[PDB]
Each structure stands twice: as structure tokens, then as C-alpha cells.
Amino acid sequence: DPTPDQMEGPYFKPDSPPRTSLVTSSTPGVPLTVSGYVFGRACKPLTGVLLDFWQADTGGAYDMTGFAFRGHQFTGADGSFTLRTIVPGLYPGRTRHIHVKAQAPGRPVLTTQLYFPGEPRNTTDALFDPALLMNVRSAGPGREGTFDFVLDVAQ
Numbered sequence: 001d002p003t004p005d006q007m008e009g010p011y012f013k014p015d016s017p018p019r020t021s022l023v024t025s026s027t028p029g030v031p032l033t034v035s036g037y038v039f040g041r042a043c044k045p046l047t048g049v050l051l052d053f054w055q056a057d058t059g060g061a062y063d064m065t066g067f068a069f070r071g072h073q074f075t076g077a078d079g080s081f082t083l084r085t086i087v088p089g090l091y092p093g094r095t096r097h098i099h100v101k102a103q104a105p106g107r108p109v110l111t112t113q114l115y116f117p118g119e120p121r122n123t124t125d126a127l128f129d130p131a132l133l134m135n136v137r138s139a140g141p142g143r144e145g146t147f148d149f150v151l152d153v154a155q
């Protein structure tokens, strides 16, 4: 309220495919589904918001040749989103994170990141921001993330 912005990073690639799922049962890593809503200025759900996610694989590598672990979606009538993925791996200098660009129809793009609770690197990574923490709880062999966006959109 409202979701803080952060840098894009060198590993963004435009033109991600449309998909809410980035993984299969055969994808290595700890299963993670992240879900929530996009709200505007009056705490009301926003429809048709573009959410474009990218992240490292379980071993901390980004795909620069293809679009593995890159995918975008649009919020539905209820303003909800869902992302089925795996927990991204650590890589040099950074705590654990998922990248996201959010764009409400006809508005500027918000570039930001999502962080994980209880990660030791949250204390070492200067880029870390507790306002961008997901809630994360166990769900069998995997995990469930919860995060709501608030965009600067008048209602």
C-alpha cells in the first residue's frame, strides 16, 4: 500500500509467453505456488492487470537463451493471480527473490521483487525490503506463497 518498486536487474527478457505455470512435476526444485490479488487505491480488486514474472531456477540460474522460468498473466474479474513455480535458488550477492513487473491497463509499469520470510540473506542483501515479503507456509513437500499488490490506480 502501495507496493514499492525495485530494480529490473540484468536478467529480464521482454516478450515472455503467457502462462501461470512455469513448472511441471518433472521440474527439479521445491514446489511453490504464489497467489494473491492486485488492489488499487481504494482497496478494490483490479481487473486486467499484467503480471510478468521471472526468476532463477532451483540452482540459481536465469535462462538467457530461452524463456524457462519466465511467464506473464492478467488478473481476472476478481483481481486475483496465481503462479505455479519452484523456490528459486540462491546466486552470488543476492537473497532469494522472484522478479515481477505489474502494469494496470493504460498505466506505467511497476518493476519490483518478492522476498521470502526467514532467509538469512535478508540480513546481508541491501536490496531487501520487508514490505516486499511474501507470507510463505508449508504445503506438503512444497510451499505456498501469499502476496497482495497495491498499485497507484485511482478508484
Ligand SMILES: [Fe+3]
Binding pocket: 009, 011, 094, 097, 099
Ligand atoms: Fe535476480
